[PDB]
Amino acid sequence: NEKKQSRLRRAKSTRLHIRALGATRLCVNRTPRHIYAQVISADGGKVLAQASTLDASLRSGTTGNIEAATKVGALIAERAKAAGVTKVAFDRSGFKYHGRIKALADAAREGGLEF
Amino acid sequence: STKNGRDSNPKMLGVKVYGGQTVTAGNIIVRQRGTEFHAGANVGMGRDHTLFATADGVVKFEVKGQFGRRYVKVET
Amino acid sequence: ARLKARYNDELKAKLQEELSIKNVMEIPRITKITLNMGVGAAATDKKLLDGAVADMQLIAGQKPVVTLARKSIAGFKIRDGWPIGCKVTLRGDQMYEFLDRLISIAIPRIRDFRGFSAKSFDGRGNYSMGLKEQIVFPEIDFDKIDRIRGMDITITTTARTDDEGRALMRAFGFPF
Amino acid sequence: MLQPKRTKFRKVHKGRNTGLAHRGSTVSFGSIAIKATERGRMTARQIEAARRTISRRIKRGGKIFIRVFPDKPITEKPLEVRMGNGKGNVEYWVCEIKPGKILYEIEGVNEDLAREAFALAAAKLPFKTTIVTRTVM
């Protein structure tokens, strides 16, 4: 509650700026057990692509560490290129950019996503 | 003799372009002290909180968000 | 050091039985202990200004922080943003160590020590003690001591009622 | 005579007294009331005089509810000054009276003694008044 409430307060600024820029957004979410990435439209309503640690290719392994995040980043980069999404803005969603989030973002940069 | 004779010059504030009117880029829409109107799409804000059109289109006023803000936007 | 594993191994079932707490998670635990030392005489000298911080860093293993002033109370002769306090927050592996080193090596070391004041719960399981001098501390020595001030201590626990707080403080062997 | 303990501003525009009194028009504190059917101003001196003549008459039995309070300051120029040089000085305070306004209410007194008291008070006021009773809707 208090944690999620404060983190969403931290995310609002970047989210409103991304909406004002009118850009495709790579929104990420991180829980102690899993990680998620969604490539979302500029209008904020349509999910153009997605990836997570629930994919029958990462779930059977272990999730919630930096290696699983790198794998998710590679997978979301591929799926986003498949749907014709190249230029994105990274939405860390109130999480610090360092760590698992950074691993996902680096895997996505190397996968072909431009940001 | 009293101590009241002062006032300042007029500032000519207010809505300059109303809803439905066509604008070009750079046209001033609102002269305001604070933000009684907030910039929506294709509308920028100047240092003195002036709302101006950053694109051609028609002006549209709305009430949006959970703070019930008045928004100006330009439809292209 | 001792108190942590003691509560982890002995006091847990004891508290659960004595208080009748069904869920394991909702059992009274100690969350933090904060030692504040208000010193209003700050703009007057430096002995009693950094002496509180040094006495804390001696007593508490962790360094202190300088609590500033939030407003400008005229009758108090303070202005917004001026150092008027000091504090330290012991959380874990040091909070239990402070509880030990104050409840079994310095608890009964003050002159004419009655039991305690056991009606200070703040409507919840959070207790607040008091002290008149640092002489009781087995760390600060009365030779090096100077400009005797006193410290306030507040133990914050994950307790709901004052009864649960009383139980959690008794299991730790309080002065009652 | 009544007066605000303090105000935000010393002097006030003249204004227009127009319309009917739809708010303070119902007997709400007592059993009988005097009600203004005409429009005007009520100085604080008039309020004091009418309260005195009512209270001396009903002889302290029952309570009197004053429902008007003078909160408008009225200025006047000193004698033998010309028309400029700022606004005149405050002299007295008035309450604006719209037709239908309850001025005084009496609780705990029979109807005839209270009507005598209200007739005595009416001769101290600058507008026409009426005697009204409490109803139920």
């Binding site: - | - | 962790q62 030990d100 080193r101 090596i105 608890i107 009964p108 039991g115 760390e139 009652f176 | -």
Partner: protein
């Protein structure tokens, strides 16, 4: 914890005057010799 900011706190054995030798991690830098204890008081 920040390292080069805090004080030093090491082990410490406590010799009570009533046979209740204790052990604690404190900042006395020596061996404590207690007179009063949580067993040798009027609590």
């Amino acid at each position: 914890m920040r390292a080069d900011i805090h004080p030093k706190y090491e082990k410490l054995v406590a010799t009570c005057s009533c046979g209740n030798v204790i052990e604690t991690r404190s900042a006395l830098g020596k061996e404590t010799i207690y007179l009063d204890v949580c067993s040798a008081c009027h609590p």
